[model samples]
Target chain A: AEAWYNLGNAYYKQGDYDEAIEYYQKALELDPRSAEAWYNLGNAYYKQGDYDEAIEYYQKALELDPRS
Target chain B: AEAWYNLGNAYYKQGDYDEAIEYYQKALELDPRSAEAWYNLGNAYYKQGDYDEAIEYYQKALELDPRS
Candidate 1:
């Protein structure tokens, strides 16, 4: 799960939003409670201009970890 | 200058804030009037946990291109 999450992050940092989202999905498949993964997914969607999807994931991330 | 600026963007996208700053500095040296470079430099420093420098560069960018 963490490996997939980190893969998402690397792609995100590389500005490859599509790949980031794909890896985040893979991470979530293994562990849905991964707050970091959710947050990165939200961020990826946000950067990709998918505000609705971003907000949905952001809400999920916030619910998992408000202080995050 | 464009090459340097593009390199800065590449580093910023790579999450290499230090490298981003270095390239952005090179861009600025060639084109001090670049509002885009200043704004991105602010972002790079902000990500590097340098709030004061980020604000300083942000201010410079706003001065150069207030509409940005």
Candidate 2:
């Protein structure tokens, strides 16, 4: 889970939002409760100008970790 | 600088300390006075268990922003 999450972060940093989203999804599959992964997925979508998808993930993240 | 700095942040969050350090270095190269970049660089080195390098970067960060 952590490995996939880290890979997502690496791709996101490289400005490859699509790749980031894919890795983040893999991470989420392994660790569904990971708010960080969900939040980062939202960020990746947001970067790609997918506001609706971003909002959905953001809401999921917020649901898991309200303080985030 | 902001882009590189954000990249650093992404890597750091993912626990890719080495990658985070590289991006932070890029950010610092573009904006040498960025305390945030310096501080995060220290954090990356710290995560890698390089106490000496972490301390050096931390000191630099403190010098740039005493409040930090």
Candidate 3:
């Protein structure tokens, strides 16, 4: 699961938002408490101009890891 | 393809069109439909005097980023 998440990160850094979302969703299903996963999801959504969805994921990320 | 887009941008910013194109192409191999990747690839090609290819990529990016 974590492996897939990093793979998602790799895709995200390469500007592949669609692939990043796919892997992030897989990572979340494995471990929902992963704040970074949620944060990355927010980023991908934000890149696509989906502000509401981005904020939603950011809220979840904050709830899991406030320091982040 | 990992981090290819970012590396491409780094090279692009440094005025290294050759290396930028190389990295951007790597990113595209992993993700054919990445709008930002396509846009950056277009920019890189444009700088290299490849207007035709640049326009092709720009069109693809436009297709992906219709709202933008």
Candidate 4:
């Protein structure tokens, strides 16, 4: 899960949000309760200007970890 | 230069500073005046806790683009 999350972050920082989203989703598949993966998935969507999807993931992340 | 710089950024964000430094050096070889590359090289070095090399690259970057 951490490996997939790290890969997502690498792609995200590289501005490859689609790839980032894919890896983040994979991470979530392995660890559905990971707030960090959900939050970063939202960030990837936000980077691509998909506010609706981003907000959905953000809500999920916030639900898992309100402190985030 | 852009490709190498982008690769470097990818590695850097992945926490692979050694690989990032290698690609940043490759970028500099192609475009010696790239302040962005120099600055990011400094950032990679900084991440590795190599303050001396970091400061050196930072100085070079600042020299190339004083506004940075």
TM-score of each model's chain B: 0.97, 0.96, 0.90, 0.97
Which 10 residues in a row give candidate 2 chain A its minimum summed lDDT? A59-68
Kindly report which residue stretches of model 3 are placed more than 4 angstroms away from their true locations once superposed. B1-68
Chain A vs. true chain A, TM-score per candidate?
A: 0.96, 0.97, 0.95, 0.97
> What is candidate 3's DockQ?
0.03
Residue A33 error, candidate 3, Å: 0.7
Q: How well does candidate 1 score on lDDT at residue B7?
A: 52
Candidate 2 chain B worst ten-residue window by lDDT: B2-11
Interface RMSD of each: 14.2, 11.3, 12.7, 14.8
The number of the candidate with the highest lDDT is: 4
Candidate 1 clash pair list: none
Q: Give, for candidate 4 chain A, the lowest lDDT window spanning 10 residues.
A: A2-11
How good is chain A of candidate 1, measured by TM-score? 0.96
Ranking 1 against 4 by lDDT, winner: 4
Q: Against the true two-chain complex, what DockQ does each candidate achieve?
A: 0.03, 0.03, 0.03, 0.03
Which clashing pairs does model 3 show? none
User: How many pairs collide in each candidate, listed in order?
Assistant: 0, 0, 0, 0
Error of 4 at B58 (Å): 28
Q: Report the candidate with higher lDDT, 1 versus 3.
A: 1
User: What is the C-alpha lDDT profile of model 1 across B5-66, one tens digit per residue?
Assistant: 65566557767789779878988988999899999999999998999999999999999989
DockQ of 2: 0.03
Model 3 clash tally? 0
